[PDB]
Amino acid sequence: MMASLFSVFDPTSSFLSNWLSMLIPLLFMVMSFWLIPSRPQFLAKSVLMGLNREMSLLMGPASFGANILVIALFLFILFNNFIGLFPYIFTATSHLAVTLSLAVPLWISFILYTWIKETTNALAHLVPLGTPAPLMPFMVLMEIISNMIRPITLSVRLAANMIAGHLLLTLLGAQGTLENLYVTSIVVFSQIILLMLEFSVAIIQSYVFMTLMTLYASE
Amino acid sequence: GDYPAEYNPKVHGPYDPARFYGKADVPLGQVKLGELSQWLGRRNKNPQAVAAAVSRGWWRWQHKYVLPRKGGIAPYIQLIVGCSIFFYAINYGKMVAHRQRKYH
Amino acid sequence: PWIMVFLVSMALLWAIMTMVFFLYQPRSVSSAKGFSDRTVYLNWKW
Amino acid sequence: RIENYKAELGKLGQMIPFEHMTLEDFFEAFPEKVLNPDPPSPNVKKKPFKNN
Amino acid sequence: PRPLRPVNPGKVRVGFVPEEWFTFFYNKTGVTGPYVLGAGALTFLLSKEIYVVEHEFYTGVAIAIMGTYGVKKFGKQIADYADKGIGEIEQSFKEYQDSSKI
Amino acid sequence: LATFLKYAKVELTPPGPADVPKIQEGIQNLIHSAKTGKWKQVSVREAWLNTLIVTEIAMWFFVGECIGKGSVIGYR
């Protein structure tokens, strides 16, 4: 009930810029040496092989070997949401260029490959199936607008979750005092509930974006 | 991106990215600080050399905390605190601009 | 500097993709069971 | 063929055990390997390529 | 030198700090040495405003409490699950070698 | 944490006030070293150990500084 603060998204606060905040997931990659794997390698391998099995129902021939790109997109999203919630790290996903890289090049990849391969089916995706003549043209124009700006909202969605998540945490932290045990315990317990929500949504947001890209690479 | 040319599989054996495969140099731990200037000037400061020195150190840390069979959560907690400490010093300019005590 | 941020993110995505590609467990599950089915036997001069 | 089987058993006798074996030595002892002109797969396995 | 895989990783106290750091001070300032320096350093950074106690500190506490509770509750199950998969791989590889010899 | 309290009794006692010749003689031995040597021949690993020993000693000055102002959480 005291105050608030913002602006945790400055890339050049120091001469060692915040581009190193994107080079942090390279550390967490499980580099493998031995034949029999270690504990975290087997955990990571079991998770990824689990996701590959689940996505195998939705792969299709046009994404015959593009599942590596989808899984790499999943791990990149997860390590840019999980690492964005740790305290003294600037919110990388808040910067739109990360979200620009997330949605725009892959959407252009999928829409141009669809247009070159199946041009009539791509235009038929802009119409609801079995649409009569008087119901045709307004559905076509709106779905043209829909399919043009749908990945832009995907980029907004990935940004907005971590922006709203980090704004909520900074709000709860700034409205607490160290000296007051009652306020500190309330603030800490409120953030723990909020972090459990924010950790859960971050994993689920990465899971749905893998599912959406697997569906849209199948076609 | 290849195995370093100083590596010999016949003498050393299989490759190990945590072992320095050049000439066996005396490490800085046993330098009596009278050879400190000589030791620092002898080791080259190429971008290639420091990048290889980082990877040889990183794989040494993997060999001590992850690559053993019963690797616990301790490496992954050390990295988080290590990155948080390093990124707090980077964002020190924004943090110290607010502070808490007017005099301290 | 959106261009530099985009390039780093894409280069990271390529580096994560390569790390995933080699992240696997090779297995050797080809025993000598087929060798036991190759019993070469002489035709008898009846 | 007996000498071939004896040579194969000699290879298995001289093979280092799979417990303390580096991944490069597993690729060296079993030359099936993987490289650039190799069948790609999300998990490079024995038969992940055709499956049709 | 043939690289031999160790069974247990390096010794670690207080969750993440290396034990090689703590034993480095034993010959001069004993066991209490590293803890004294750590307590003094934490006091110095808080007192001289080097460690800014801002809103993110409470998030840092909340992560630390959640991480300790989550690891202590599920660490044994996950490590046993991973060790189960390693044992199945080890059993698979040793059975392949025995079947090939037979 | 009784053993932590036990070790605190063993090796956090105030130093012997009778050691005043025995600490200045060591200081004078270090002064004898200071213009002559005993630091250009000490291993960097042990030299880094010696510097952190001084760092451990110098931290008590800031601990005493927090005591002299009362509360240790900044200036109250």
XYZ file of C-alpha atoms in Angstrom:
599
model
C 0.000 0.000 0.000
C 3.124 2.170 -0.110
C 4.413 2.633 -3.677
C 5.494 0.810 -6.840
C 8.371 0.640 -9.305
C 8.953 -0.526 -12.867
C 11.517 -0.399 -15.713
C 13.499 -3.596 -15.205
C 14.038 -3.890 -18.987
C 17.078 -1.714 -19.712
C 19.535 -3.583 -21.989
C 22.467 -1.178 -21.504
C 22.473 -0.382 -17.778
C 26.214 -1.173 -17.752
C 28.972 -1.450 -20.342
C 28.643 -5.229 -20.055
C 25.182 -5.095 -21.577
C 22.159 -7.275 -20.830
C 22.671 -9.321 -23.995
C 24.503 -11.754 -21.704
C 21.108 -12.403 -20.091
C 20.220 -14.270 -23.288
C 23.460 -16.283 -23.176
C 22.569 -17.803 -19.775
C 20.622 -20.852 -21.136
C 23.864 -22.010 -22.780
C 25.126 -22.766 -19.273
C 22.087 -24.860 -18.347
C 22.406 -27.061 -21.444
C 23.288 -30.577 -20.318
C 26.591 -31.271 -22.025
C 27.065 -35.036 -22.211
C 30.366 -36.869 -21.828
C 29.986 -40.408 -20.513
C 28.295 -43.368 -22.166
C 26.016 -44.043 -19.210
C 24.464 -40.602 -18.633
C 24.374 -38.656 -15.401
C 21.230 -37.919 -13.401
C 20.336 -34.531 -14.990
C 21.149 -35.757 -18.499
C 18.782 -38.707 -18.158
C 16.094 -36.414 -16.745
C 16.485 -34.008 -19.659
C 16.634 -36.876 -22.157
C 13.520 -38.515 -20.699
C 11.613 -35.221 -20.791
C 12.585 -34.442 -24.385
C 11.942 -37.997 -25.586
C 8.617 -37.782 -23.773
C 7.698 -34.593 -25.627
C 8.827 -36.096 -28.937
C 6.528 -39.073 -28.349
C 3.602 -36.789 -27.500
C 4.231 -34.574 -30.531
C 4.588 -37.641 -32.785
C 0.792 -37.775 -33.109
C 0.790 -34.264 -34.623
C 3.965 -34.197 -36.734
C 2.879 -34.956 -40.291
C 5.052 -35.253 -43.400
C 5.689 -31.528 -43.911
C 7.376 -31.410 -40.484
C 9.236 -34.684 -41.045
C 12.387 -33.511 -39.282
C 11.369 -30.089 -37.986
C 10.557 -31.415 -34.499
C 14.085 -30.453 -33.431
C 13.219 -26.829 -34.202
C 9.955 -27.079 -32.253
C 11.642 -28.642 -29.215
C 14.441 -26.069 -29.361
C 11.766 -23.380 -29.489
C 10.172 -24.980 -26.427
C 13.397 -25.031 -24.406
C 14.201 -21.462 -25.433
C 10.791 -20.225 -24.268
C 11.058 -22.141 -20.992
C 14.535 -20.801 -20.211
C 13.413 -17.263 -21.063
C 10.436 -17.462 -18.692
C 11.957 -19.426 -15.814
C 15.103 -17.294 -15.805
C 13.025 -14.115 -16.048
C 11.473 -14.737 -12.632
C 14.728 -14.942 -10.686
C 15.196 -11.584 -8.925
C 18.278 -9.773 -10.215
C 17.812 -10.617 -13.903
C 16.260 -8.221 -16.397
C 13.105 -9.478 -18.099
C 14.365 -10.657 -21.487
C 10.901 -11.610 -22.756
C 9.678 -8.082 -21.964
C 11.841 -6.871 -24.840
C 9.764 -7.260 -27.997
C 12.808 -8.248 -30.085
C 12.943 -11.592 -28.271
C 9.232 -12.024 -28.993
C 9.826 -10.741 -32.532
C 12.399 -13.510 -32.950
C 10.008 -16.000 -31.359
C 6.991 -15.555 -33.628
C 7.770 -13.633 -36.820
C 10.433 -15.766 -38.605
C 8.691 -19.070 -37.878
C 5.261 -17.757 -38.889
C 6.666 -16.472 -42.190
C 8.308 -19.889 -42.574
C 4.992 -21.674 -42.095
C 2.781 -19.346 -44.141
C 5.136 -19.162 -47.141
C 5.701 -22.924 -47.156
C 1.925 -23.379 -47.009
C 1.397 -20.854 -49.824
C 4.001 -22.461 -52.099
C 2.881 -26.037 -51.389
C -0.917 -25.740 -50.960
C -2.051 -22.320 -52.185
C -5.750 -23.159 -52.570
C -5.866 -24.940 -49.203
C -4.211 -21.919 -47.567
C -6.932 -19.687 -49.021
C -9.526 -22.268 -47.956
C -8.184 -21.974 -44.401
C -9.186 -18.289 -44.577
C -12.820 -19.378 -45.089
C -14.868 -21.474 -42.644
C -15.584 -24.880 -44.145
C -18.910 -25.299 -45.923
C -19.605 -21.554 -46.055
C -22.445 -20.506 -48.398
C -22.248 -17.564 -50.782
C -24.026 -14.833 -48.704
C -22.013 -15.873 -45.630
C -18.692 -15.980 -47.515
C -17.049 -12.561 -47.940
C -17.170 -11.082 -44.433
C -15.830 -14.312 -42.924
C -12.996 -14.313 -45.474
C -11.915 -10.724 -44.770
C -11.961 -11.123 -40.983
C -10.094 -14.438 -41.117
C -7.565 -12.820 -43.464
C -7.049 -10.242 -40.715
C -7.062 -13.086 -38.181
C -4.346 -15.167 -39.846
C -2.212 -12.084 -40.553
C -2.113 -10.857 -36.932
C -2.507 -14.176 -35.064
C 1.278 -14.772 -34.648
C 1.660 -11.122 -33.619
C -0.682 -11.875 -30.720
C 1.393 -14.992 -30.014
C 4.416 -12.719 -29.581
C 2.309 -10.413 -27.407
C 1.135 -13.414 -25.358
C 4.670 -14.598 -24.600
C 5.660 -11.066 -23.597
C 2.548 -10.217 -21.581
C 2.688 -13.211 -19.220
C 6.189 -12.427 -17.978
C 5.558 -8.671 -17.968
C 2.425 -9.119 -15.856
C 4.178 -11.760 -13.766
C 7.174 -9.568 -13.003
C 5.033 -6.466 -12.454
C 3.016 -8.380 -9.862
C 6.113 -9.633 -8.041
C 7.765 -6.204 -7.981
C 4.500 -4.715 -6.711
C 4.304 -7.220 -3.854
C 7.960 -6.737 -2.948
C 7.901 -2.940 -2.954
C 4.872 -2.810 -0.629
C 6.685 -4.616 2.178
C 9.095 -3.637 4.934
C 12.014 -5.613 6.346
C 11.519 -4.483 9.951
C 7.850 -5.496 10.216
C 7.691 -9.273 10.625
C 3.944 -9.391 9.906
C 4.232 -7.483 6.625
C 7.349 -9.375 5.502
C 5.764 -12.775 6.190
C 2.579 -11.728 4.373
C 4.621 -10.405 1.438
C 6.786 -13.539 1.302
C 3.808 -15.906 1.490
C 1.930 -13.891 -1.136
C 4.902 -14.084 -3.499
C 5.251 -17.840 -2.902
C 1.639 -18.334 -4.007
C 2.248 -15.974 -6.923
C 5.490 -17.729 -7.890
C 3.724 -21.106 -7.879
C 1.171 -19.566 -10.226
C 3.899 -17.925 -12.308
C 6.024 -21.070 -12.515
C 2.961 -23.099 -13.517
C 1.830 -20.667 -16.217
C 5.374 -20.346 -17.609
C 5.671 -24.103 -18.176
C 2.137 -24.334 -19.575
C 2.700 -21.332 -21.864
C 5.782 -23.062 -23.251
C 3.817 -26.299 -23.647
C 0.931 -24.691 -25.535
C 3.302 -22.811 -27.848
C 4.990 -26.096 -28.708
C 1.539 -27.578 -29.346
C 0.432 -24.636 -31.493
C 3.575 -24.716 -33.630
C 3.359 -28.502 -34.008
C -0.216 -28.134 -35.272
C 0.740 -25.292 -37.611
C 3.810 -27.107 -38.951
C 1.739 -30.225 -39.658
C -0.377 -28.316 -42.188
C 34.960 -26.448 -34.365
C 37.293 -29.427 -34.065
C 39.479 -31.252 -31.581
C 42.563 -29.169 -30.686
C 45.657 -29.942 -32.734
C 47.824 -30.319 -29.621
C 45.791 -33.398 -28.669
C 47.487 -36.746 -29.293
C 45.335 -39.877 -28.833
C 48.357 -42.198 -28.826
C 50.070 -40.793 -25.723
C 47.222 -39.231 -23.741
C 44.431 -41.599 -24.728
C 40.807 -40.615 -25.290
C 39.991 -36.926 -25.422
C 38.965 -35.194 -22.200
C 37.779 -31.568 -22.516
C 38.784 -30.774 -18.918
C 42.480 -31.581 -19.465
C 44.927 -29.164 -21.081
C 46.479 -30.962 -24.055
C 49.368 -28.570 -24.715
C 52.786 -28.519 -23.124
C 52.635 -29.246 -19.395
C 52.917 -25.768 -17.889
C 53.361 -25.095 -14.178
C 50.004 -23.799 -12.875
C 49.610 -20.478 -11.092
C 48.834 -22.153 -7.754
C 52.468 -23.029 -7.038
C 53.905 -19.800 -8.471
C 55.701 -18.068 -5.594
C 54.530 -14.589 -6.825
C 58.070 -13.767 -7.893
C 57.294 -15.461 -11.208
C 53.809 -13.907 -11.400
C 54.762 -11.322 -14.034
C 56.636 -13.974 -16.025
C 53.716 -16.410 -15.759
C 51.136 -13.821 -16.844
C 53.240 -12.598 -19.765
C 54.009 -16.138 -20.920
C 50.359 -17.181 -21.200
C 48.940 -15.666 -24.372
C 45.753 -13.597 -24.390
C 44.250 -14.583 -27.728
C 40.457 -14.764 -28.039
C 41.044 -18.383 -29.061
C 43.228 -19.049 -26.008
C 40.836 -17.553 -23.457
C 37.856 -19.310 -25.071
C 39.688 -22.627 -24.824
C 40.643 -21.738 -21.253
C 36.985 -21.115 -20.405
C 35.842 -24.428 -21.890
C 38.666 -26.296 -20.151
C 37.518 -24.695 -16.913
C 33.834 -25.293 -17.606
C 34.394 -28.977 -18.290
C 36.484 -29.181 -15.128
C 33.476 -27.859 -13.225
C 31.244 -30.344 -15.029
C 33.665 -33.093 -13.996
C 33.339 -32.092 -10.350
C 29.610 -31.462 -9.958
C 27.547 -33.018 -12.792
C 29.438 -35.790 -14.627
C 29.726 -37.984 -11.494
C 26.864 -40.451 -11.220
C 25.193 -39.080 -8.089
C 25.123 -35.449 -9.201
C 22.801 -33.527 -6.918
C 21.086 -30.159 -7.192
C 24.195 -28.351 -5.920
C 25.588 -27.398 -9.385
C 22.225 -26.006 -10.489
C 21.932 -23.939 -7.315
C 25.506 -22.710 -7.704
C 24.780 -21.515 -11.244
C 21.662 -19.602 -10.171
C 23.448 -17.776 -7.352
C 26.465 -17.315 -9.615
C 24.350 -15.747 -12.346
C 22.355 -13.689 -9.837
C 25.542 -12.354 -8.230
C 27.041 -11.569 -11.633
C 23.892 -9.878 -12.915
C 23.411 -7.840 -9.753
C 26.816 -6.237 -10.295
C 25.820 -5.500 -13.896
C 22.558 -3.849 -12.813
C 24.319 -2.115 -9.898
C 23.799 1.286 -11.520
C 20.022 0.919 -11.500
C 19.939 -0.653 -8.028
C 22.206 1.888 -6.300
C 20.229 4.788 -7.795
C 17.352 3.988 -5.402
C 18.963 2.656 -2.169
C 17.396 2.779 1.303
C 19.553 4.969 3.576
C 20.093 8.649 2.812
C 23.409 8.767 4.714
C 24.546 5.161 5.455
C 19.320 -2.199 -31.175
C 16.676 -4.731 -32.214
C 18.900 -6.240 -34.917
C 21.666 -7.225 -32.495
C 19.157 -8.653 -30.005
C 17.442 -10.632 -32.772
C 20.739 -12.074 -34.016
C 21.791 -13.224 -30.536
C 18.408 -14.856 -29.900
C 18.498 -16.668 -33.246
C 22.110 -17.732 -32.676
C 21.076 -19.009 -29.252
C 18.160 -20.885 -30.826
C 20.567 -22.510 -33.265
C 22.936 -23.440 -30.434
C 20.135 -24.949 -28.346
C 18.887 -26.841 -31.406
C 22.307 -28.382 -32.029
C 22.644 -29.361 -28.362
C 19.253 -31.088 -28.505
C 20.291 -32.902 -31.691
C 23.202 -34.665 -30.004
C 21.296 -35.133 -26.734
C 20.517 -38.842 -26.959
C 21.458 -42.277 -25.649
C 23.027 -44.715 -28.128
C 22.264 -48.385 -27.595
C 23.708 -51.667 -28.849
C 20.804 -54.121 -28.989
C 22.092 -56.360 -31.796
C 23.112 -59.644 -30.171
C 24.236 -62.853 -31.915
C 20.718 -64.328 -32.094
C 20.769 -64.140 -35.892
C 24.138 -65.905 -35.908
C 22.425 -68.926 -34.329
C 20.046 -69.112 -37.321
C 22.885 -69.408 -39.881
C 23.612 -73.102 -39.261
C 25.219 -74.134 -42.549
C 24.819 -77.884 -43.020
C 26.116 -80.174 -45.741
C 23.705 -81.754 -48.190
C 24.058 -85.528 -47.942
C 24.794 -87.600 -51.039
C 21.710 -89.827 -50.893
C 34.177 -68.888 -39.778
C 35.528 -70.293 -36.503
C 38.531 -67.963 -36.776
C 36.114 -65.107 -37.474
C 34.108 -65.932 -34.345
C 37.330 -66.231 -32.338
C 38.389 -62.803 -33.618
C 34.975 -61.412 -32.660
C 35.293 -62.871 -29.157
C 38.806 -61.449 -28.985
C 37.328 -58.059 -29.859
C 34.780 -58.422 -27.057
C 37.525 -59.549 -24.687
C 39.682 -56.526 -25.510
C 36.688 -54.163 -25.430
C 36.724 -51.814 -22.430
C 33.681 -52.284 -20.163
C 30.661 -50.067 -20.688
C 30.771 -48.617 -17.162
C 33.862 -46.404 -17.429
C 33.679 -45.770 -21.163
C 33.670 -42.331 -22.737
C 31.123 -41.658 -25.464
C 33.865 -41.143 -28.048
C 35.315 -44.564 -27.222
C 31.857 -46.089 -27.645
C 31.748 -44.531 -31.108
C 35.283 -45.744 -31.824
C 34.666 -49.332 -30.708
C 31.341 -49.425 -32.595
C 31.925 -47.688 -35.940
C 28.228 -47.203 -36.742
C 28.766 -43.623 -35.509
C 27.093 -40.403 -36.621
C 28.461 -37.582 -38.778
C 27.381 -35.029 -41.388
C 26.413 -37.493 -44.222
C 24.169 -39.438 -41.843
C 20.390 -39.929 -41.524
C 18.990 -37.114 -39.370
C 16.491 -37.753 -36.587
C 15.157 -35.908 -33.510
C 16.763 -38.712 -31.526
C 19.533 -40.354 -33.509
C 18.515 -43.985 -32.949
C 18.944 -47.282 -34.800
C 15.756 -47.068 -36.918
C 14.125 -43.623 -36.568
C 14.428 -42.613 -40.234
C 12.068 -44.386 -42.639
C 9.417 -46.102 -40.449
C 7.063 -46.423 -43.426
C 45.888 -40.797 -17.650
C 42.659 -42.672 -18.342
C 39.670 -40.547 -17.212
C 37.831 -42.582 -14.578
C 34.244 -41.689 -13.709
C 33.855 -40.911 -9.991
C 30.814 -42.159 -8.126
C 30.036 -39.155 -5.936
C 30.464 -35.467 -6.845
C 32.487 -32.916 -4.925
C 31.647 -32.309 -1.290
C 29.370 -29.323 -0.753
C 28.216 -27.477 2.363
C 25.356 -24.985 2.768
C 23.641 -26.419 -0.303
C 25.899 -24.982 -3.009
C 29.226 -23.694 -1.614
C 32.205 -25.977 -2.352
C 33.788 -27.759 0.582
C 37.198 -27.095 -0.982
C 36.625 -23.420 -0.190
C 35.727 -24.190 3.425
C 38.696 -26.515 3.953
C 41.016 -23.914 2.397
C 40.900 -21.819 5.594
C 41.377 -24.697 8.046
C 45.156 -24.378 8.409
C 44.959 -20.657 9.281
C 41.588 -19.702 10.801
C 40.123 -23.145 11.433
C 36.608 -24.380 10.783
C 34.885 -21.185 11.950
C 36.968 -19.099 9.522
C 34.929 -19.291 6.293
C 31.679 -18.819 8.212
C 33.110 -15.745 9.957
C 34.219 -14.211 6.652
C 30.867 -15.018 5.059
C 28.915 -13.503 7.943
C 31.137 -10.420 7.937
C 30.844 -10.012 4.170
C 27.048 -10.322 4.297
C 26.921 -7.733 7.086
C 29.242 -5.364 5.206
C 27.262 -5.488 1.954
C 23.971 -4.869 3.763
C 25.293 -2.096 6.015
C 27.242 -0.113 3.402
C 24.262 -0.209 0.971
C 26.207 -2.303 -1.549
C 23.432 -4.901 -1.428
C 20.324 -2.886 -2.280
C 17.383 -4.360 -0.354
C 14.764 -3.603 -2.986
C 11.525 -5.349 -3.969
C 13.386 -8.157 -5.747
C 14.984 -9.276 -2.470
C 11.618 -10.556 -1.246
C 11.219 -12.484 -4.502
C 14.710 -13.864 -3.921
C 13.611 -15.024 -0.480
C 10.401 -16.506 -1.898
C 12.335 -18.490 -4.511
C 14.784 -19.709 -1.862
C 11.996 -20.917 0.430
C 10.113 -22.563 -2.445
C 13.278 -24.177 -3.784
C 14.244 -25.614 -0.403
C 10.740 -27.000 0.145
C 10.444 -28.426 -3.362
C 13.859 -30.102 -3.370
C 13.514 -31.597 0.116
C 10.092 -33.013 -0.799
C 10.800 -34.475 -4.253
C 14.589 -34.829 -4.424
C 14.711 -38.425 -3.210
C 12.006 -39.594 -5.624
C 13.523 -37.930 -8.698
C 17.066 -39.103 -7.923
C 15.799 -42.655 -7.418
C 13.818 -42.388 -10.660
C 16.916 -41.246 -12.545
C 19.045 -43.939 -10.898
C 16.401 -46.487 -11.904
C 16.759 -45.481 -15.551
C 20.552 -45.602 -15.315
C 20.376 -49.093 -13.826
C 18.091 -50.259 -16.630
C 20.558 -48.908 -19.195
C 23.435 -50.605 -17.366
C 21.472 -53.866 -17.241
C 20.656 -53.548 -20.947
C 24.298 -53.049 -21.908
C 25.681 -55.865 -19.758
C 23.004 -58.269 -21.021
C 23.921 -57.398 -24.610
C 27.561 -58.277 -23.961
C 26.674 -61.574 -22.278
C 24.220 -62.536 -25.027
C 26.808 -61.759 -27.710
C 29.396 -63.969 -26.000
C 26.892 -66.810 -25.558
C 23.607 -26.426 16.633
C 25.302 -27.162 19.956
C 28.544 -28.134 18.199
C 28.528 -24.754 16.445
C 28.276 -23.153 19.887
C 31.021 -25.480 21.142
C 33.381 -24.519 18.307
C 32.495 -20.865 18.927
C 33.786 -21.188 22.489
C 37.003 -22.847 21.302
C 38.110 -20.477 18.533
C 36.305 -17.176 19.045
C 37.804 -16.213 22.398
C 39.345 -12.758 22.789
C 43.133 -12.941 22.494
C 45.405 -13.088 25.506
C 46.231 -9.617 26.830
C 49.643 -10.959 27.881
C 50.459 -11.622 24.206
C 51.336 -7.938 23.636
C 55.082 -8.654 23.242
C 54.219 -11.854 21.350
C 52.057 -10.067 18.778
C 54.345 -7.056 18.276
C 57.354 -9.357 17.848
C 55.369 -11.092 15.128
C 54.460 -7.644 13.808
C 58.120 -6.600 14.009
C 58.960 -9.856 12.228
C 56.458 -8.824 9.548
C 57.998 -5.336 9.501
C 61.383 -7.042 9.115
C 59.778 -8.886 6.203
C 58.074 -5.749 4.855
C 61.210 -3.941 3.677
C 63.022 -7.215 2.859
C 60.658 -9.936 1.649
C 58.641 -13.006 2.716
C 55.994 -12.069 0.124
C 57.799 -12.416 -3.240
C 58.582 -16.053 -2.348
C 55.145 -17.110 -1.031
C 52.982 -19.166 -3.391
C 50.077 -17.342 -5.039
C 47.635 -19.908 -3.650
C 49.042 -19.272 -0.173
C 49.320 -15.547 -0.906
C 45.632 -15.524 -1.842
C 45.002 -17.368 1.428
C 46.954 -14.697 3.322
C 45.009 -11.858 1.690
C 41.673 -13.451 2.566
C 42.933 -13.860 6.142
C 43.459 -10.088 6.220
C 40.035 -9.752 4.600
C 38.589 -11.912 7.381
C 40.360 -9.710 9.940
C 39.315 -6.446 8.282
C 35.665 -7.526 8.188
C 35.570 -7.301 11.993
C 36.295 -3.578 11.662
C 33.042 -3.189 9.737
C 31.320 -5.540 12.191
C 32.539 -3.256 14.967
C 31.342 -0.290 12.905
C 27.837 -1.770 12.859
C 28.063 -2.336 16.620
C 29.209 1.226 17.335
C 26.200 2.708 15.530
C 23.740 0.405 17.303
C 21.570 -1.601 14.925
C 23.461 -3.459 12.201
C 20.757 -2.848 9.557
C 22.123 0.449 8.291
C 21.977 3.661 10.298
C 18.763 3.663 12.328
